[PDB]
Structures are given as structure tokens and as C-alpha cells.
């Protein structure tokens, strides 16, 4: 039976650590993939970590120049949560350099984008069988969430982008039922930019918090129902979530232009007028991570928050982050549990290696007592292949 | 649930990439088999990749001189599709230097040929239990498809060859039910040559497109029903599919002699009078791969096609290719879905290594939009063991 989605996000106070794979520490000697962009998606029985391999193992000569995102060798795989991605415990999902995946309560839906930059095609697999394809409609780099898509009531929803990365692009919302795209609308969002959305279900609707890579240092959001009837805007909290970003000050509900023309994939959870903001500690580089609770940060432009919880330290590398939920048919509760994952990038651009890779940590929100610490990557670089 | 097989091939306009294992890129550091001649066969629940190991791991001293096809150390194994063949995730099937395997909807049937050249014996396993054996009847190299056999209605059919590789040989069609050979006929095909057939079911009959290694630069075919009542011929299309082959020109329905006295295993799908031809891009070496759609290429010798789709670039190595289908009990559709796989050979006879191996890619035909690209092997040779 499919997952209903009629439940609201559970009440939280803090985040308790869920998993940690130690991929790069293990991959020094073991046979571990050179991955990037992991994400966690939960079925009604388990939770899996999906990652985009570079086609090569870590500490190997084929990992040379794996800073590049688009190659014909990247594939989407999955391993059980908290385990290092190795060829001996990973399940092959799709051939993709951009991907997303989610579970409707019956079978896994996998979306995988591969092909040339001006002709990329998304191959939709349902239960491992190719069911539909979506071709690029602007003949620019076609890209998708890099995190889980959201099913409510048997229908999974996803957002894709096609167009310039420094200007106005084309944004589409797709409604997918058992691998068939049954409905899609193209968002009319002038002067907005949406990339790498992180979507979660809430009260039967879908809420996506995306990355503004053009002229915004706060984050844009889009909310829609099962009819793909949408609303758009930005998070008005003066506690900016993007990276690079300015120092905290008076925020805005339109794009924040200052120091905003790039970004990193992130997330946020809406609790009435409040928001749980997950952002890096440094305003210039992807170092650190914290969770901010602004009780009025969805509609007010103040810069005053209520609670901070520390995840990594300003001295340790961090990377992409995204949100997933655990449906009541998995946890047994009466509400949807909000969780999130963080990617800890080690290697190039910043470090003097030949490769770039990332391990992951993940946290789940609880209503009991929690503590803030630093759970860094812990890998000691450079490796043997760099010498 | 034995397969019904009364279904006809699905209508398709292109091919969407299904899998890619990156075996040789991973095998540089990981423990990955030295395989060759992979093929994909699907059950009613999953699809598996069958391969013929050389008995040794890649980048090891026992991979020395693995260009040879017949040795007492070769075995047939299988791994889930899209995963690198390693001893830690592979299932042992049979001891063979020539093999084929297919699933009747209840259990796997495995055929494995091993033994001396003048006395080779095929050992038929059903559900892992030896059920029957077929001994060479011409005391020459006995050989089989190297791709999946075809079941329609609980009976799997296969084609075997025994005799000279540069002259007239002996060709037999076998009808196998639950591991017992219940019927077999020897084809009366003078001036023809059949090797390494790739068979698929279509409308309750079986269609095999084989390799002419004696005197045909086009491909021969044999079609038969469940009574083993057969028809023979060649693909008339002036777009030759074998390799080596002449340049495209006026073609033939009988053997094409020019530049034809060798070949490579290939395939083709018959759509009325049309044909989907899968062939290498270069006419002299196994480099490249494309899919040609000749709307009248099964009976007319024109040399004029309608659609090309690019799979690998003429600058990248390719190898064997074959056809498999996904039955309606797997896909849930009402047609038999045509798919195909390609083997990407790296190593000797054309690289300066001590070993030869091959990874694989696979595509499935869809009626939606698709794109042509190049998905090459991507391995950086030579390895450490070659130094």
C-alpha cells in the first residue's frame, strides 16, 4: 500500500545523530567508491543511502581528476545507511550524473540524468524497469534535486531545472505515478532561481527549499499540492542559509543580491512561521554546519534566533546537505519525522589531492534532550596516490 | 508462472541506457574478475549479468595470457546487473568456456560447454542440478550462443554449432524443457554459417540472428516455431552488420562474400520489413557502436536508412553485442520489450597488456525521447601488472 502523506511534521527540539559511514577513512585501505552528492531516502522497511559514483575506487589512479561532475562513467548506486560505499555491498540503480530517488511504499522510483549537455535525457526506472524518459527542453544542462523526491498518496513529485546557471532558467514540477509522468507544469517564476531542491511532504502538500545560484544569498522555496498548483517566494529570515552569504542582518523576502551569486544545496523546515535553518558556519567557504531555530524566520526579516545546535566545526569541511523524512508507516508514529544529512567533501578544490570525494552524516529530529558536538570527516590527507 | 510468449515486440523509437558496470575501472584496485563475453538474461523478478571468468582476478599475475578462450579454469558466473564481477558478489553457475543461460519463469537453465576440442560436452543444469548432457557430434570445437536462450511457454530453445570455423559446419536447434532435451533438429543450411546466435521470442516463435564467420559480411538468421520447423536466410539490408565488412552499398539476401570471412557476434530486431541493426562504427576493427533503423532492411537491399543512434565513439573500443528481452511478467507491459548489451573489450589483442577483459553497457528500447552519446569503457591502460 502507498504512503498517504496526510500527516504534519512532528514537533522537534533538537537533532540526534543517526548515521556516519566513515567512507574516506575506510577507503584509504579498503575498496570504497569515489562518490559525491549522497542522499538518504527511506522506504517503509529501511533507509538507504544513494550516491553518485565517479566510476572509480578511492586511492586509485582512476580517481585522478574526479572534481568533474559530468562524465559517462558516473552511476547512481545505493547502500544501507551508515555503511561505506563499496562495490561489494552496493546496489546499482541507474547511469546518471544527476539523480534523485524515492519510495512510494511499493517500489523504488529512480530518476537518472545522463547524456550530452545540450541533449541530456532523464531515465525513469520503477522497480528497476525503465518506464519513462524526460528529455531536456532547453538544450542546456538538465539537472535534478540530488536528494529524495516526495511521494504523498502514491504519487512522487520532483523538480527539474534546464537553462543558464547564472541567469533565468526553466523550472518544471513533475508528478510521477508508478514511473509514468502523469502531469507536469512549468513554473512562472521571473527573477527567481531554483536549483537542487530538497522537498518534503507536509499536511498533504509538498514543500521544496532550493538553491539560488544567480542573485540570491537566501533560499527560495516552492510549495504545491497534488494538482501542481504552486506558490513561490524566499525565506525572509535575516539568518541567511546559502553559501557564500553576507553577515547576518536585516533579511528580505525577494532575492538578497549581496554576495549571493553562487550557492550550496541546503534545506529548511517550516513550522508555522518558524524555520529550522541548516547552514555552514563560515560565510565564505563550505566549513562547519549548524542548525538554527528562528521562531519567526519564515515571514519576519529579523536576524534574531532562539536555538543553535552545532554539527561540525568552522575548521572542518562540510558540503551539500538535504532533508528527508521518515513516514509514519516506518516509524510507527502519528506524524512525519524530519531528518537531514550532510556531505563532508574532502579533496579538491581546496586540498592538494588528485581526487574529490565525500562521506556523510545524518541526524533525525527528536523531542527529547540532545547535544551539539562536531562529527567531522576525519580523513588524514593526502593519500598514497597523491604522492 | 511459465512465460506465455504469445506477445509481439513493443513499438520503439530509440534506446535508453539501462546499466553500466565500470568493471575495469573498478578492477584496477578492487578484486574484480577477468571476464569476457558477458550477457544479460532476465527472470520474472530481476535481471542478471552472466559472464565467463578466466579463473583469475584483474591486475594479477594469473591474468597473464588471458586472450585464450578455452582453458580448464573458465567458469560461468552471474552477478546482478550493473555491478562489477567480483568473487564476493558473484554466483557460480557452471564450469564452461562456452555458455548460455535463460529463465523459464520457474528456475534458471544453464548450459555450459567444457572439455577437449574434439570431445567437448555441454552440461545442462536446471535450478543448479545437472539434468542432461550433450556431447559433440562432429568432434570439433562445440560452441553455443554466448547470450541468453529463449523460452516461450516453458520451453527454452538454443542453437549450437560443431565443425569448421572457416567452412561448412553442423547446426542444431535444441528444445529443452526443465533441463531435458526433448527435441532437436539439425538444420539443412548448405552454403550458410551460423555462430553465436542471439535469439529472442516474437509472437510465439523464435528468431535468431547469428554470425557468419566463413563467407558473409551480412548476418544470417533462422526462425522456427515450437515444432522446430525452421526458415533460413540472410538480412538483405545494404547496411551490413558484421565486422569486418565492406562499405555500405547494394546488399544481398544470400551470403555477401566481400571482406566477409570473419565476424563479431551481433543482433538485429525484425519489425515487419524493417530492422534495427546494431553494429560497430568502424568497418575494420571493433571500435564504436551505433543502432540503425532501416524501415525496409529485412527484404530490400537499398543501403538507405531512417535513424541512427550513437552508442560508443569510433575512437573507443567495443566488442560483442547481443539481444535480450524483458517478458510482460517482468515489465507488466503487454509487449515483449527489446533490449541489448554491448561488450567493451580492453586489453590484448590490440593494447600492450598481458590480459584481455571486457566491461558491459546495456540499453532498453523505449517509445519516448532519447539521446545518442558515447558511454565508453573508460579504463586507463596499461595497469600495474603490465609494467
Amino acid at each position, epitope marked *: 500500500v502507498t504512503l498517504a502523506g496526510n500527516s504534519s511534521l512532528c514537533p522537534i527540539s533538537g537533532w540526534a545523530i543517526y548515521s556516519k559511514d566513515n567512507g574516506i577513512r575506510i577507503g584509504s585501505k579498503g575498496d570504497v567508491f569515489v562518490i559525491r552528492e549522497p542522499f538518504i531516502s527511506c522506504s517503509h522497511l529501511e533507509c538507504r543511502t544513494f550516491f553518485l559514483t565517479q566510476g572509480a575506487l578511492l586511492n586509485d589512479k582512476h580517481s585522478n581528476g574526479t572534481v568533474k561532475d559530468r562524465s559517462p562513467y558516473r552511476t547512481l548506486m545505493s547502500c544501507p545507511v551508515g555503511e561505506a560505499p563499496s562495490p561489494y555491498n552496493s546496489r546499482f540503480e541507474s547511469v546518471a550524473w544527476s539523480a534523485s530517488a524515492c519510495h512510494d511504499g511499493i517500489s523504488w522510483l529512480t530518476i537518472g540524468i545522463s547524456g*550530452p*549537455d*545540450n541533449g541530456a535525457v532523464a531515465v525513469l526506472k520503477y522497480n528497476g524497469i525503465i518506464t519513462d524518459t524526460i528529455k531536456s527542453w532547453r538544450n542546456n544542462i538538465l539537472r535534478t534535486q540530488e536528494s529524495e523526491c516526495a511521494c504523498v498518496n502514491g504519487s512522487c513529485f520532483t523538480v527539474m531545472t534546464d537553462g543558464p546557471s547564472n541567469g533565468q532558467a526553466s523550472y518544471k514540477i513533475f508528478k510521477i505515478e508508478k514511473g509514468k509522468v502523469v502531469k507536469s507544469v512549468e513554473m512562472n517564476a521571473p527573477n527567481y532561481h531554483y536549483e537542487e531542491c530538497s522537498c518534503y511532504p507536509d499536511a498533504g502538500d509538498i514543500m521544496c527549499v532550493c538553491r539560488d545560484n544567480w542573485h540570491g544569498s537566501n533560499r527560495p522555496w516552492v510549495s504545491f499540492n497534488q494538482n501542481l498548483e504552486y506558490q513561490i517566494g524566499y525565506i525572509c529570515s535575516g539568518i541567511f542559509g546559502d553559501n557564500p552569504r553576507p553577515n547576518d542582518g536585516t533579511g528580505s523576502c525577494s532575492p538578497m543580491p549581496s554576495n549571493g551569486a553562487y550557492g550550496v544545496k541546503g534545506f529548511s523546515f517550516k513550522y508555522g512561521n518558524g524555520v529550522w535553518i541548516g547552514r555552514t558556519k563560515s560565510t565564505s567557504s563550505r566549513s562547519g554546519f549548524e542548525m538554527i531555530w528562528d521562531p519567526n524566520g519564515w515571514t519576519e526579516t529579523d536576524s534574531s534566533f532562539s536555538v543553535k545546535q552545532d554539527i561540525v566545526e568552522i575548521t572542518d569541511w562540510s558540503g551539500y546537505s538535504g532533508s528527508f523524512v521518515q513516514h509514519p508507516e516506518l516509524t510507527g508514529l502519528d506524524c512525519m519525522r524530519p531528518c537531514f544529512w550532510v556531505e563532508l567533501i574532502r579533496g579538491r578544490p581546496k586540498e592538494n589531492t588528485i581526487w574529490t570525494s565525500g562521506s556523510s552524516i545524518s541526524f533525525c529530529g527528536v523531542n527529547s534532550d540532545t547535544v551539539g558536538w562536531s562529527w567531522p570527516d576525519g580523513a588524514e590527507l593526502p593519500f598514497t596516490i597523491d604522492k | 508462472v511459465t512465460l506465455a510468449g504469445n506477445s509481439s515486440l513493443c513499438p520503439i523509437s530509440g534506446w535508453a541506457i539501462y546499466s553500466k558496470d565500470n568493471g575495469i575501472r573498478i578492477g584496477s584496485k578492487g578484486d574484480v574478475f577477468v571476464i569476457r563475453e558477458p550477457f544479460i538474461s532476465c527472470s520474472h523478478l530481476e535481471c542478471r549479468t552472466f559472464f565467463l571468468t578466466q579463473g583469475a582476478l584483474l591486475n594479477d599475475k594469473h591474468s597473464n595470457g588471458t586472450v585464450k578462450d578455452r582453458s580448464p579454469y573458465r567458469t560461468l558466473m552471474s552477478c546482478p546487473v550493473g555491478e562489477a564481477p567480483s568473487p564476493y558478489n558473484s554466483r557460480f553457475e557452471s564450469v564452461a568456456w562456452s555458455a548460455s543461460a535463460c529463465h523459464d519463469g520457474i528456475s534458471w537453465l544453464t548450459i555450459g560447454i567444457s572439455g577437449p576440442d574434439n570431445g567437448a560436452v555441454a552440461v545442462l543444469k536446471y535450478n543448479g542440478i545437472i539434468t542432461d548432457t550433450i556431447k559433440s557430434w562432429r568432434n570439433n570445437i562445440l560452441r553455443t550462443q554466448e547470450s541468453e536462450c529463449a523460452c516461450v511457454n516453458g520451453s527454452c530453445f538454443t542453437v549450437m554449432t560443431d565443425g569448421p570455423s572457416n567452412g561448412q559446419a553442423s547446426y542444431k536447434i535444441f528444445k529443452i524443457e526443465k533441463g531435458k532435451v526433448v527435441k532437436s533438429v539439425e538444420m539443412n543450411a548448405p552454403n550458410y554459417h551460423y555462430e553465436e546466435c542471439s535469439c529472442y521470442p516474437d509472437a510465439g516463435d523464435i528468431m535468431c540472428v547469428c554470425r557468419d564467420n566463413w563467407h558473409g559480411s551480412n548476418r544470417p538468421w533462422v526462425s522456427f516455431n515450437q515444432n522446430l520447423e525452421y526458415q533460413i536466410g540472410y538480412i538483405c539490408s545494404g547496411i551490413f552488420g558484421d565486422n569486418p565488412r565492406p562499405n555500405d552499398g547494394t546488399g544481398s539476401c544470400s551470403p555477401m562474400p566481400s571482406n566477409g570471412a570473419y565476424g563479431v557476434k551481433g543482433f538485429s530486431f525484425k519489425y515487419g520489413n524493417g530492422v534495427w541493426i546494431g553494429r560497430t562504427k568502424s568497418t575494420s576493427s571493433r571500435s564504436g557502436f551505433e543502432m540503425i533503423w532501416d524501415p525496409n532492411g529485412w527484404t530490400e537491399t537499398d543501403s538507405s536508412f531512417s535513424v541512427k543512434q550513437d552508442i560508443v565513439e569510433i575512437t573507443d573500443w567495443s566488442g560483442y553485442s547481443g539481444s535480450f528481452v524483458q517478458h510482460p511478467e517482468l515489465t507488466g507491459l503487454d509487449c515483449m520489450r527489446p533490449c541489448f548489451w554491448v561488450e567493451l573489450i580492453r586489453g590484448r589483442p590490440k593494447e600492450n597488456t598481458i590480459w584481455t577483459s571486457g566491461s558491459s553497457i546495456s540499453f532498453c528500447g523505449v517509445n519516448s525521447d532519447t539521446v545518442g552519446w558515447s558511454w565508453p569503457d573508460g579504463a586507463e591502460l596499461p595497469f600495474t601488472i603490465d609494467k
Partner: antibody
Amino acid sequence: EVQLVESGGGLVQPGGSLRLSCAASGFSFTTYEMNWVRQAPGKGLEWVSHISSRGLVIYYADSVKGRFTMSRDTAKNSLYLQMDSLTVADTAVYYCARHYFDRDWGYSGMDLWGQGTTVTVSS
Amino acid sequence: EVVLTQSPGTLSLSPGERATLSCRASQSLGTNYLAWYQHKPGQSPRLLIDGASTRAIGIPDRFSASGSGTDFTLTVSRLEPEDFAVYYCQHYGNPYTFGQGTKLEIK
């Protein structure tokens, strides 16, 4: 194992026309952006033109805009440059260079070059 | 338009001491997209520093670079006989320009 080889340079009189060709090996144009860079004898490097991996020509130098034409053939992995109405200031040595646009980090920087071809104008 | 000015037009040193080369941007550069190239006569240019702070693949630890806003610096702690060439600073963000270069030769 990746290579870019320019060809086509020679002696041409003023006001003539010419066309260079950079053949690339080991990589596909459908992923990397390409560039024409020229060095005049006695001057520094100058960025002539820049074409995307999507086939859009992003940049022309101010001096050469309206006169040069940059194109490519992806099925052949070839990059071309048609110069028309050549002047005496177009004497230089030309390179075809390659860089990358990363979806996350952005542009990368010209990583791989050729030796280049000399274009000289006499009388 | 943004012009990049390398302060030392020519710079001569002995084989084995610190060499500091510099570029000054006319207008601040919001993009952190500035690279350094080494051009030896008779050979193609080579990428040394990318992102104004990071050595490329295969470039030795000998080179280093730093900068902020309009100031950018390339430092070679210990020169070598093969370390003498022309050094360029490039802005590959909008607008696309190169610098004028600086020649290092044995004194």
C-alpha cells in the same frame, strides 16, 4: 592521453582569409568548453573567443568581433576558426585551449593546450 | 572592463631565493576566478594556480599563491633553473581578460 592539435597556420597577404582547425583526442566536446588564445610577437596572451559545451559562442575579443567566426563539429571533435579580412595586427601564434564548467563549483581554468600555429602577414 | 596590471614588468633573481609576482585589478573582482599561468618560450602555457589560492594537479609544492579583493600574489620560495618563464594572471570571470605578464631570468 588527452591531446589538442591545432593546424592551418601559414603566410597570408593582408585582407585575405584563413581557417584553423584544432583536432582533439581523448575527450568529447559535449562536456568541455573551448577557447582560442593568441599571442602576438612581443605581447602577452590574448583571449580571442570562447565557445560553450552546449555550442553557444559566449565570447569574442573586442578587436576580432565581426571578423572572426568560431564553430565546432562534435561528431568529429573539431574546433574551427575562420578569420576574414586579416590585418597586420593579426600576426600571432594561436592556441586552442580547454576548460570546464562545473555545475557546483563553476568555471575551472584552461587546463590543456596545444603547441599552436603561427599566422603571419607580409607586405 | 577590468584591466589586470602585473606590477613587475621584468624581474631578475638568482637560482634559489623567494620570488613574489603580483597583479592588481583595476576594479574589485567579486568572482574569485583568477588563475596563474607559466609560459616557457617554445612551449604551451601551463596552469599553475587556479581559484587564486590552489595549486593545479602536478604543480609542485614550490609554488604558492594568495590574494584578496584587488591584490593577488604568487610566491616561489626556492627557485630552480626551470622555474624561469613568463607568468600571467587571468580573470576568467566576466569580463574575460589576461594580464600583461612578467619575465623571470637568471641574474
